[PDB]
Amino acid sequence: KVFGRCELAAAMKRHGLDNYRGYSLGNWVCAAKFESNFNTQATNRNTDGSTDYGILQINSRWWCNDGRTPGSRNLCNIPCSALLSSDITASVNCAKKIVSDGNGMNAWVAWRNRCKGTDVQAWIRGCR
């Protein structure tokens, strides 16, 4: 599923992301924009052999199992395919674990590079 901007904002708000760990709803939408382009089925293979899955490009080395990443932790205890469903529940539940690892949203390389410090307010523009 390719989410609309406001569509993911309401989907992320409902699931508990708005100001989760002090990260305004804008930061998550912004992250999901530069990670997956609001596409839930986004899959990106990293250089280390692992793969990023879903709306928030969650890595398969630490957070989910794709069976093709030796040393896979599966800390969210889910198959990486579950991070590609139209329902972003799995992705949010795990993102809450990722953003609580200590480094916060810095875990998302796109967020730190394209969102952090920026006017993330603008991502929930006109969003009802």
Swiss-Prot record:
Q: Which GO terms describe its biological process?
A: cell wall macromolecule catabolic process; defense response to bacterium; defense response to Gram-negative bacterium; defense response to Gram-positive bacterium; killing of cells of another organism
The set of disulfide-linked cysteines is 6-127, 30-115, 64-80, 76-94
Q: Which domain of life is it from?
A: Eukaryota
Q: In which tissues is it expressed?
A: In the egg white and polymorphonuclear leukocytes.
Record bears the keyword Signal: yes
Q: Which CDD domains match?
A: LYZ_C
What residues make up the catalytic site? Answer: 35, 52
- List the record's Gene Ontology CC terms alphabetically: cytoplasm; endoplasmic reticulum; extracellular space
Q: What is its EC number?
A: 3.2.1.17
Q: List each copy of the C-type lysozyme domain by range.
A: 1-128
Where does this protein reside within or beyond the cell?
Secreted
Q: Name one GO molecular function term.
A: beta-N-acetylglucosaminidase activity
Q: What keywords sit in the KW lines?
A: Allergen, Antimicrobial, Bacteriolytic enzyme, Disulfide bond, Glycosidase, Hydrolase, Secreted, Signal
Q: Which residues bind substrate?
A: 101
The record's annotation in InterPro entries points to: Glyco_hydro_22 (IPR001916), Glyco_hydro_22_CS (IPR019799), Glyco_hydro_22_lys (IPR000974), Lysozyme-like_dom_sf (IPR023346)
Reactions catalysed: Hydrolysis of (1->4)-beta-linkages between N-acetylmuramic acid and N-acetyl-D-glucosamine residues in a peptidoglycan and between N-acetyl-D-glucosamine residues in chitodextrins
Subunit note: Monomer.
What protein family does this chain belong to? Belongs to the glycosyl hydrolase 22 family.
Q: What does this protein do?
A: Lysozymes have primarily a bacteriolytic function; those in tissues and body fluids are associated with the monocyte-macrophage system and enhance the activity of immunoagents. Has bacteriolytic activity against M.luteus.
Miscellaneous remark of the record: Lysozyme C is capable of both hydrolysis and transglycosylation; it also shows a slight esterase activity. It acts rapidly on both peptide-substituted and unsubstituted peptidoglycan, and slowly on chitin oligosaccharides.
Q: What is this protein called?
A: Lysozyme C
Annotated organism of origin: Gallus gallus
